[PDB]
Amino acid sequence: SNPYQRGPNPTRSALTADGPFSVATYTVSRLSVSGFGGGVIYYPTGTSLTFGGIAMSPGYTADASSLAWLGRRLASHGFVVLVINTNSRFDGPDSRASQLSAALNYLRTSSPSAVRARLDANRLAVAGHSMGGGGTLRIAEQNPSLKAAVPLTPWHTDKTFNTSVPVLIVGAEADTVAPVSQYAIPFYQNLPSTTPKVYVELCNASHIAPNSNNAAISVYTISWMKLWVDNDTRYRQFLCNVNDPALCDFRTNNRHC
Ligand SMILES: [Ca+2]
Numbered sequence: 500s501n502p503y504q505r506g507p508n509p510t511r512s513a514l515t516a517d518g519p520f521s522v523a524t525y526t527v528s529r530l531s532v533s534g535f536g537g538g539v540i541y542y543p544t545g546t547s548l549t550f551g552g553i554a555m556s557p558g559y560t561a562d563a564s565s566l567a568w569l570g571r572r573l574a575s576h577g578f579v580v581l582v583i584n585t586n587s588r589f590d591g592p593d594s595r596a597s598q599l600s601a602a603l604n605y606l607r608t609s610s611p612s613a614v615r616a617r618l619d620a621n622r623l624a625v626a627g628h629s630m631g632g633g634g635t636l637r638i639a640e641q642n643p644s645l646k647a648a649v650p651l652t653p654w655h656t657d658k659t660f661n662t663s664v665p666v667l668i669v670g671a672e673a674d675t676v677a678p679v680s681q682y683a684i685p686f687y688q689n690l691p692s693t694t695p696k697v698y699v700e701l702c703n704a705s706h707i708a709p710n711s712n713n714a715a716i717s718v719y720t721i722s723w724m725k726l727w728v729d730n731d732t733r734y735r736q737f738l739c740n741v742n743d744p745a746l747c748d749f750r751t752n753n754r755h756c
Contacts (some may be wrong), residue, residue, distance in 0.1 A: 503622065503729040505548060505577035511737060515714040516752040518576035518713035521545045527610055529584065532609070534601025536584035538563045540616055541574035551728035552579045553648065554571060554602045555692050558629025558654070560588045565710045566628060569720065576721050578728070579618045590653045592633025599625055599638045603608035620644055622728050626720060628709045629654045629677060632668075638666040649687065649720050652677050658685045665721040665755065667738075669716055671704035679748075683754075687750060688719050695755045697723070697738060700748035710718045715745045724756060726736040743746045 506519050520543035529537040543550060553573060556609075557565045563582040572583040583602045585595060607620045624647040627635040632653025639648040639662040648662070651669045654677035670683030677683065679700060687698040699719050701708055709716055718737055725734040739756035741749050 500558045501730055501732075503551070503619070504731050504733070505550065508733055509725075509737070511718060514576070514718045514737065516607050516717075517572055518721075520575050520577055521569055522574045523597065524571075525614065527581070527605070528612075532587055532601070532605050535598035535605070536586050538581055538583040539567065539570065540606070540610060540614055541570040541580045541582070542617060543577055543579075546617070548602050548618040549617050550577050550579050551624065551724070552581070552603070552606050552618050552620065553624045553626060553724065553728070554599045554606065555625070556581060556599050556627035556631030556634045557582070559591075559630075559642045561628070561710075562588070568712050569626075569709070569716065572717055573721065573724065576725070578724060579606070579614060581610075590630075592630045593637050595627065595631050595634030596637035598642065598663070599627070599634055600642065624724055624728050626627065626651065628638070628652060629706065630683065633701070636660040636662070636666070639666060647723055649723055650683075650714065651720075652683065652706050653686060654682055655686070659689040660686065661691060663691065663694050666690055667697040667699070667719055669709070669719060670698065670700040670748070671706055671708050672700055673704055674706045676706035692752060693754075696752055697755070698748065698750040699743075699746055702745060702747040715743065
């Protein structure tokens with residue numbers, strides 16, 4: 500049996516709402532940490548188990564609140580999640596990668612005792628929005644110890660990331676900021692053919708789709724994190740044989756099926 504498996508058997512409906520774990524938060528002040536701008540930790544409560552960790556970056560001009568719904572959503576399905584604020588709201592994608600690295604170090608070492616007590620530091624992942632998704636791609640390339648990476652409507656001027664970390668990219672069909680033809684799709688195509696990878700494109704969605712409750716983002720992000728952070732094969736069903744009415748594209752090399 501899988502020692503990292505958490506929660507009841509999933510249904511698709513259950514992955515579109517907060518999950519079976521209650522969630523608490525801890526606010527990490529900007530002045531209290533080195534290498535990033537603080538943020539908010541979301542973590543499961545009412546449980547004696549340990550969970551994988553996820554660090555998430557917002558995009559240009561944005562703060563951690565722009566991903567609060569998703570940090571809480573992931574935590575409620577069984578993850579310790581640190582959504583960062585950046586040193587400057589104007590930091591670029593590679594800077595955001597460096598800050599995600601600093602945030603993962605903080606999460607493992609200097610976060611509250613209660614957070615470390617429910618964190619399995621051996622199982623970590625990253626996600627992020629826009630330039631924060633660019634940072635997710637870069638840290639995945641720099642840090643093959645990561646279990647998974649989920650760039651959401653990502654933006655970066657570099658298009659090729661030589662990473663072995665399994666990547667699921669969410670593109671937005673109606674994105675006029677990081678259009679999928681110039682950003683998300685090239686990122687997917689240029690990843691190594693040997694790295695497990697998925698691209699999903701949300702029909703009719705804008706660049707700010709990741710900043711509020713979104714059923715498809717919830718399903719695909721939870722499932723990819725579950726499959727790779729927890730080795731939880733019960734989530735393969737949502738990532739294989741896909742026929743999703745909300746998607747206008749789906750690409751994969753089918754290394755996870
Ligand atoms: Ca700081």
